[PDB]
Design a protein around this ligand. Structure first.
Ligand SMILES: [Mg+2]
Length: 254
DNA sequence: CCGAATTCG
């Protein structure tokens, strides 16, 4: 990362399925190999568990780890040492969650710009749609409340179905979805796909765009690319996770 | 963490 690339922020968002204990150390090594290949400035993770934090300290040692809770399973935001300056951590509760979900925010400086970086793992399954929608509203509200000077990026596992975003009030006028902004490219549309991914051993073919990136911006933040990661089977014959990860690059413009 | 079917409280 040199002078030429200094206007850009790169990141990965990935639900890494720490609730699956089987082959977890090898799968963590697979996630870390991906981080080494692309060297993102920031990593947003969901379903981290305490042992997984130890694997990241060993095989992703160039990242500072900020977590959404201490026990059970939780989200994390990883910041590249020497690139990102950590300013503060905020956690916003979801009072009606039945799955210990919340909103994790980290305020940082990167590339001479101020950012509020946010992640969450919204309430899972079709049955919990009403609570998922209430949580999405909490997230969007927090994005809007940020100081006008700051660049806000949310990346996480939303568990959203398209019909649910419409029920919420659509994305607000100054908030954009990176995949939509880039023209809805087919190569990275689905992030959870049981035809292509065997980790859950589901004997059926369903696919969803559960993992999403929202940003608040006029002309000041411009997505450059979006691609999937984690599509290679590991030595054990399984993937790093039941989800694919997303690799995104954005340009910060005067 | 799908969704249809089933069983539990
Ligand atoms: Mg999961």
């Amino acid at each position: 990362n040199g002078l030429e690339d200094s206007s850009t922020i790169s990141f990965i968002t990935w639900n890494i399925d720490g609730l699956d204990g089987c082959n977890l150390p090898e799968r963590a090594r697979g996630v870390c190999s991906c981080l080494a290949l692309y060297s993102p400035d920031v990593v947003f993770l969901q379903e981290v568990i305490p042992p997984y934090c130890a694997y990241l300290k060993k095989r992703a040692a160039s990242y500072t780890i900020i977590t959404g809770n201490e026990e059970g399973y939780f989200t994390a935001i990883l910041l590249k040492k020497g690139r990102v300056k950590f300013k503060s951590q905020e956690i916003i509760p979801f009072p009606n969650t039945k799955m210990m979900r919340n909103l994790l925010c980290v305020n940082v400086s990167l590339g001479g710009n101020e950012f509020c970086l946010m992640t969450s793992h919204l309430e899972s399954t079709r049955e919990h749609s009403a609570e998922r929608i209430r949580q999405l509203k909490t997230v969007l509200g927090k994005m809007q409340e940020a100081p006008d000077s700051t660049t806000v990026i949310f990346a996480g596992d939303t568990n959203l179905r398209d019909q649910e975003v419409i029920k919420c009030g659509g994305l607000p006028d100054n908030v954009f979805d990176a995949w939509e902004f880039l023209g809805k490219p087919k190569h990275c549309q689905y992030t959870w796909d049981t035809k292509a991914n065997n980790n859950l051993r589901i004997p059926a073919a369903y696919k969803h765009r559960f993992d999403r990136i929202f940003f608040r911006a006029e002309g000041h933040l411009i997505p450059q690319s979006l691609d999937l990661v984690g599509l290679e089977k590991l030595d054990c014959g399984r993937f790093p996770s039941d989800h694919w990860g997303l690799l995104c690059t954005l340009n910060v413009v005067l």
